[PDB]
């Protein structure tokens, strides 16, 4: 919910910065001169940057060796069909490259197989000047490397086509991460319109980073493969380590936990990693069931949680959610819900992004007005 | 091993035990594809394979010109 707190950083800024330098007069000549004897060399450009440059396809050599004796003459010798089909096979990659650049106007994401094959991506990702642990992480999970990469059209001139691929750099490895899921916590009185609700707005990923906690408010953007959480620090907040204190005492004075309030008590369910949170309200009927045994549990009004052991589907009203059958141990912490401590006559239910301190001071101001 | 904890007091659940792979910076690499300097094809043969080669070279030249437009 806190996605509006991010700063608007241009992701393609580095790639377009390198691309702009290559547009300067003479830089393409330097790229050709440095790549003259080898397939990979680091070139120092006018900006002072040193970027590794690689050549991935040379259709010039193929054409100038095989097709010049055939099509560049008056008395054309008849080519074999093997040459024709080999030419389509070799040129197909360039046709898909140009098609993707045409459709996406020269900035493509994710990096497709035509932008960079997996063998060339593995070679280039091993050739980066980085630590061995980073190389191991990158090589074992190249698909998320593709999903977090851009390919930027740069130049086409002097018989040279160039596009700048922009691989991610994972500067943080194996720090502990945890995902916070949140469901609306509401009262359960029988009167329809007297209900008040409270929802923690700080749902999303958290990962340790250099003595602070990187909070990622958009959980859908972060990819998860098995036990590993692939996130981006560009769309992240930096938070003090007091943010951990919200999960054990939401009323702690060191860090004000962020919540939103309303009065729309809707029956909803949040499928967590190892269970399901169901918040059944009003006259809605909510149950958790086993695929073979039928209904095994019925939820009373309020906030409740069911483990993934035994349960295969969960139904809340007319919508059915499937629970994750991941292996793992789940714990239920009994406690009085915090919504019962608020006076319904003075509860401020008009906040879209607030905190416990803001709600408390608003309640205090409302009591002072009385 | 991933462990999950539910808090009834705040109606929230934390799933902990994950390992980070946070992207902090960018690495920019310049990828080059060398293109032929063909000006025009002067072949006038009516053979079907020559026509196929001309068609594929025509769409290749159209792709090169389209990249030059970009």
């Amino acid at each position, epitope marked *: 919910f806190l996605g509006f707190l991010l700063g608007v950083g241009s992701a393609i800024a580095s790639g377009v910065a390198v691309s702009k330098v290559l547009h300067l007069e003479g830089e393409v000549n330097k790229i050709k001169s440095a790549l003259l004897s080898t397939n990979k060399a680091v070139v120092s450009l006018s900006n002072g940057v040193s970027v590794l440059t690689s050549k991935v396809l040379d259709l010039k050599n193929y054409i100038d060796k095989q097709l010049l004796p055939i099509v560049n003459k008056q008395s054309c010798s008849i080519p074999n069909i093997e040459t024709v089909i080999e030419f389509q096979q070799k040129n197909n990659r360039l046709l898909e490259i140009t098609r993707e650049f045409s459709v996406n106007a020269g900035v493509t994401t994710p990096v497709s197989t035509y932008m960079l094959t997996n063998s060339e991506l593995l070679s280039l990702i091993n050739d980066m000047p980085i630590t061995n642990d980073q190389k191991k992480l990158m090589s074992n999970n190249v698909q998320i490397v593709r999903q977090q990469s851009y390919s930027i059209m740069s130049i086409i001139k002097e018989e040279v086509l160039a596009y700048v691929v922009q691989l991610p750099l994972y500067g943080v490895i194996d720090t502990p991460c945890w995902k916070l899921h949140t469901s609306p916590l509401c009262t359960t009185n029988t009167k329809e319109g007297s209900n008040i609700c409270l929802t923690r707005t700080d749902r999303g990923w958290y990962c*340790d980073n250099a003595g602070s906690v990187s909070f990622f408010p958009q959980a859908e953007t972060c990819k998860v493969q098995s036990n590993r959480v692939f996130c981006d620090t560009m769309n992240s907040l930096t938070l003090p380590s007091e943010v951990n204190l919200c999960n*054990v005492d939401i009323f702690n004075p060191k860090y004000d936990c962020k919540i939103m309030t309303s009065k729309t008590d809707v029956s909803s369910s949040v499928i967590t990693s190892l269970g399901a949170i169901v918040s059944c309200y009003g006259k809605t009927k909510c149950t958790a069931s086993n695929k073979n045994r039928g209904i095994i549990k019925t939820f009373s009004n309020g906030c409740d949680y069911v483990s993934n052991k035994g349960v295969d589907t969960v139904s809340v009203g007319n919508t059915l959610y499937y629970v994750n059958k991941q292996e793992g*141990k789940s714990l*239920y*912490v009994k406690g009085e819900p915090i919504i019962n401590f608020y006076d319904p006559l003075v509860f401020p239910s008009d906040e879209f992004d607030a905190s416990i301190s803001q709600v408390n001071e608003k309640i205090n101001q409302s009591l002072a007005f009385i | 091993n991933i462990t999950e904890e539910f808090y009834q007091s705040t109606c929230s659940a*934390v799933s902990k035990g994950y390992l980070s792979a946070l992207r902090t910076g960018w690495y920019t690499s310049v990828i080059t594809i060398e293109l032929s300097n063909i000006k025009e094809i002067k072949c006038n043969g009516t053979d079907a394979k020559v026509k196929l080669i001309k068609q594929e070279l025509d769409k290749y030249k159209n792709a090169v010109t389209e990249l030059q437009l970009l």
Partner: antibody
Amino acid sequence: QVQLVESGPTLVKPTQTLTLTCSFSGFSLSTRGVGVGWVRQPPGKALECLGFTYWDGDEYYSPSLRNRVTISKDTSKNQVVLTLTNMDPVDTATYFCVHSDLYDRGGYYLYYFDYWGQGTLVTVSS
Amino acid sequence: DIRVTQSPSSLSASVGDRVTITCRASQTIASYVNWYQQKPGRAPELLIYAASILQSGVPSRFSGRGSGTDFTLTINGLQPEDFATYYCQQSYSSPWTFGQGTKVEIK
């Protein structure tokens, strides 16, 4: 190295006020995570906390006797002052000055007691 | 308050045996338990840093495990110097209460 030495009277008449001074070295009270407090142990009984001063100035006590125990800190004088009034015979315990650090990473905020002072004995006798 | 009491109060063991001290909480808490070993006439020392992680500067023989209501401390390879009283501390919510302790005894 961290050093923690207690000093104060060992015999105090009942109903009067008992005070303790804890001298520390090798660490600064204003360093993040560092906190100092007191844990007492009656003979043949369990331990029990009294109250803790933290780096950021926060303060609390055990609610059973929070109205009776008060601790003041002096970073400039490198001393920690513990005060407790209305000395009861049940209060006869070995009072330990204690250093604390917090487990910052992993999603925890756990204040453990890593370094313990040698402890002084206070006897409430007539 | 969240009271913690230890079921084995005066267990006895010999060198080479396995000792498991069980501390039970009044309600479900995830970790936030500490283990202190107090020699007679000496100050206690931290051994278990949090549930299932060791404190630095203590012998590696000690190991911890536990989450929820019951926490267990596993000692492998007892030594004659291990004769001491072990305490479990609850810290999930203020105030921090200590258990009655386990007066381990040697045969």
